[PDB]
């Protein structure tokens, strides 16, 4: 029948890491493609997590998630309203606005979060799902500006990846960047305040 055979949007799943715990970033694959769709569509992922930046899949998309405050956040131009794939089955979100490009799931057993920016810096770090690490110039509250441009395509798949200050500490979630021509020249993310005021 028609319903019968109406699919079912598999979850999100942790595929990778950015690794930031050491002397040096670098990406990790944790789950390969036959893996990540398997996963995709039990919802049962029995991978341990670890560190406070993933990368995630869907079946269409590849990008970042980044755990701040005990809750693991991404876009949700990236994930929509999915279900993330656990060692306990299927957990929906937690936290989702459309209107801030935000979603949330409780942070992952063994993950751990990154902590909010306290010190007001305005030299932020944008940190890719290759693990570049691209210096930013923070222009107000949701923007900053790139210190040398980028092609566009260099950025691609790094949304709900951190913008963290020199210390190491959030200060946000990157959503999207502006481009001429292809070059990457601004950034734009979701700043940990308004994170704090999804979760208040
Ligand atoms: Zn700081």
């Known amino acids: 029948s028609h319903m019968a055979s109406m699919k079912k949007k598999g979850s999100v799943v942790i595929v990778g890491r950015i690794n930031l715990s050491g002397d040096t970033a670098y990406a990790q ?18 991978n ?30 990236g994930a929509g309203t999915r279900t993330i794939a656990s060692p ?6 937690m936290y989702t606005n459309v209107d801030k490009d935000l979603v949330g799931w409780q942070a992952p057993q063994g993950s ?44 691609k798949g790094s949304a709900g990846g951190p913008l963290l ?11 999207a960047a502006v481009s001429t021509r292809g070059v990457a020249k601004a950034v734009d993310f979701i700043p940990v305040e308004s994170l704090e005021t999804t979760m208040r």
């Open 29 to 46: 694959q944790t789950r390969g493609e036959e893996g990540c769709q398997e996963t995709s569509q039990t919802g049962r992922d029995k």
């Open 48 to 77: 341990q997590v670890e560190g406070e930046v993933q990368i995630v899949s869907t079946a269409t998309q590849t990008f970042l998630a980044t755990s701040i405050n005990g809750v693991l956040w991404t876009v949700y131009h």
């Open 88 to 93: 306990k089955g299927p957990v929906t979100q």
């Open 112 to 155: 751990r979060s990154l902590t909010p920016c306290t010190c007001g810096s305005s030299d932020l770090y944008l940190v890719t799902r290759h693990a570049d690490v691209i210096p930013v110039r923070r222009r107000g509250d949701s923007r900053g500006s790139l210190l040398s441009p980028r092609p566009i395509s260099y950025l």
């Open 165 to 175: 200050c020199p210390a190491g500490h959030a200060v946000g979630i990157f959503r």
